[PDB]
Amino acid sequence: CPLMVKVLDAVRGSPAINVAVHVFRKAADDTWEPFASGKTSESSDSHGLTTEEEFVEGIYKVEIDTKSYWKALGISPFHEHAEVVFTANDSGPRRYTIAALLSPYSYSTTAVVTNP
Amino acid sequence: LMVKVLDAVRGSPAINVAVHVFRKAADDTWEPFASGKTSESSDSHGLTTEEEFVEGIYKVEIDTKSYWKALGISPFHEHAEVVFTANDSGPRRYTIAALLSPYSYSTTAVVTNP
Amino acid sequence: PLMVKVLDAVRGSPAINVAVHVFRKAADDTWEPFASGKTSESSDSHGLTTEEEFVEGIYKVEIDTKSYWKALGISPFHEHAEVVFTANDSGPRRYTIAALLSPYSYSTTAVVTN
Amino acid sequence: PLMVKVLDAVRGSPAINVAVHVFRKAADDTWEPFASGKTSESSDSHGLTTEEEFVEGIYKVEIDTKSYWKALGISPFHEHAEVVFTANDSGPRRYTIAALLSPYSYSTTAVVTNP
């Protein structure tokens, strides 16, 4: 698939399941367009939210509700949420894997961009 | 509020990195709060702001993009941000440490009883 | 059973043809070969997947990150990337070890399933 | 010349009293102890500052991340965290190894300055 948002829980060493993820495309006057949304789910090595629509050149935003994830575990995380804002400047068809490694006081996000 | 930024490709502190701040408004939108850039001098490798810190939902942006472009590298992220609630339970001393690479970054909060 | 992913944080892509050797501890400072090979790429497969199953015990994953960088004209800080851990201490599990490489930095994450 | 700073990504604070054992590659390709220490906190200086000074060569820094996590009732993935590297290969330089820790993940970054 064209887009894969993986969310990992670094305390537990498991995919953070049931996490809300909102994907947005930038528009005129900072207007953010809703591109795709959903929640993390797994089966074998698929531990995230995937979408089928490819990414045409532009600026996208990925919102991850990391606050809600930690509250369910009785924890008040530092970050109010996780946000990944990037440019899909390669207009040609590309595959984007976006990962977020979560900890109560820290998060990491990594992107792997491959061209089929 | 302190913000330390490290460059993982050069193994040194991210020099002259732009950093902006935003205090949340009653419309769930943002309003500017503070600014500055990562200034280097010995062991001081971050941006140390002076502005006192009201309780409230904040947003710290680090212009990673401009930083990498200047190094002839085309980065993935437009920027690196950290949205956190600041002093909702007495004064707290914050230090936001960021580790940067063209395709990934980590932001870690170090909170301390002032 | 075991999957080792190696990513280049500077290019945002799998680091391919990277040598990975896995060992099992047999005594203080004594490692038995478990499996080895190179990161192979093909569509969504960007790492090294081994067929061998772990038995309970301590294992070491050696990743030759130095050769990867030298092949680029870069003299990296780390001589290699080692990952030592205890496996199956609670039963048959699937391990996915990820190593993210930057010339002056590297991070390793582990995802253990079911 | 050699400093080791460790952050706890779970508690959002430096990792205090983390054991750190530095070795030096021996002529016969072995590991001879080089430094002794535990992350000490004072002011914001939480890491460990070793007095010993190096000469060109390969070194190994082992951070007992496991004892740290166990003390917090958490069974971590790694037996430890280590950083092997060739130092002063092009002239004496100052090194600071920053380690960011979580039970199932960790990173180590080298901040090398030109004296």
From Swiss-Prot, chain C:
Gene that encodes it: TTR
Effect listed in the UniProt record for changing V20L: In AMYLD1; amyloid polyneuropathy
Effect of I74N: In AMYLD1; vitrous amyloid
Impact when changing I97V: In AMYLD1; amyloid polyneuropathy
Effect listed in the UniProt record for changing T50A: In AMYLD1; amyloid polyneuropathy and cardiomyopathy
Species this protein is from: Homo sapiens
Outcome after substituting A35T: In AMYLD1; amyloid cardiomyopathy
Principal subcellular localisation of the protein: secreted
Residue range from the parent sequence: 31 to 144 of 147
GO molecular function terms listed in the Swiss-Prot or TrEMBL record: hormone activity; hormone binding; identical protein binding; molecular sequestering activity; protein-containing complex binding
Name assigned to this protein: Transthyretin
Effect of F23L: In AMYLD1; amyloid polyneuropathy
Gene Ontology biological process terms in this record: negative regulation of glomerular filtration; phototransduction, visible light; purine nucleobase metabolic process; retinoid metabolic process
